[PDB]
Ligand binder design. Sequence first.
Ligand SMILES: CCC#CCN(c1ccc2nccc(N)c2c1)c1c(Cl)cccc1Cl
Ligand SMILES: N[C@@H]1CCCN(c2ncnc3[nH]ccc23)C1
Length: 319
Amino acid sequence: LELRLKSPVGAEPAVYPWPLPVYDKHHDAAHEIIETIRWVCEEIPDLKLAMENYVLIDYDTKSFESMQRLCDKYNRAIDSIHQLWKGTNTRPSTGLLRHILQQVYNHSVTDPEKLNNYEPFSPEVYGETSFDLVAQMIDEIKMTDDDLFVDLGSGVGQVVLQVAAATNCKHHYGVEKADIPAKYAETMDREFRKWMKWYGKKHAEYTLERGDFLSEEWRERIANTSVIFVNNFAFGPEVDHQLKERFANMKEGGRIVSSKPFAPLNFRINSRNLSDIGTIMRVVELSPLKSWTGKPVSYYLHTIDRTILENYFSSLKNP
Ligand SMILES: CCC#CCN(c1ccc2nccc(N)c2c1)c1c(Cl)cccc1Cl
Ligand SMILES: N[C@@H]1CCCN(c2ncnc3[nH]ccc23)C1
């Protein structure tokens, strides 16, 4: 007893067991199946044409026969389109990417209680605000093939997967210290590569790794990173202090995007604060409210700029 969805690009079929997995009180694999079919139809106009109308209206998610009929109608339409194409790698749209990431999470994080994450930043609620704010961040910072992206404390790797599907950075890295999210990130990685191949979608290279970003090995890695992403909301003074010492080795123009600023927004260099991180970085608050109708949220963009410090010394020598 199972349900199969044929890939629109001829990759291995998606196989679901019956009874279908339940994700939460209002979300299950049956809705995921329906939404996957709809996304493929939206993406492939010939498929929308070949498939029968009623199929996506008259369905019973609690009936094996009804769900099998729905999958069969989609599969037959896939076969017709493959026959049509017989007779003579793009990035996912934002909408498709939102669906893919949720689907990857649902097939990977089967026991969300294990994460022990009760914050708004939890992987469990990533789709609510984080996905949209990360999409806004990607459009604002505009990375190229010369960039290296690193998420410090990457959880199950959701930000890394989103950024790798959307940008052309040379490489995307996620580093996570905790055992449970790092173990789940290994499944997220496998499921993401599998689903992206199933849809026929391209993504940049990425690595999700277990590790401590405060280790000796990570000092040079942070120094050589052009874009750092970090959810530093819950960081204590020691981790915060140590991380600022790591940032102090980054190159000019290096960027840090975070949930809390590492330096005051109104930093004013003087003789008493020459040791503060504010002397070598610009800091701006980015708010989608400044066609956003979501939560009134913000993130912080830091840009390594040692001319702040240089101008202070040249101003002393040039009164
Ligand atoms: C950890 C997963 C994530 C994310 C997106 N994100 C933010 C920032 C503030 C928020 N406030 C409230 C609720 C949220 N979901 C918020 C998400 C973020 C960005 Cl864009 C840049 C740098 C750091 C962060 Cl953490
Ligand atoms: N889940 C973890 C909570 C704390 C932040 N975090 C980290 N990940 C990887 N290296 C780290 N060194 C210090 C903190 C840290 C992720």
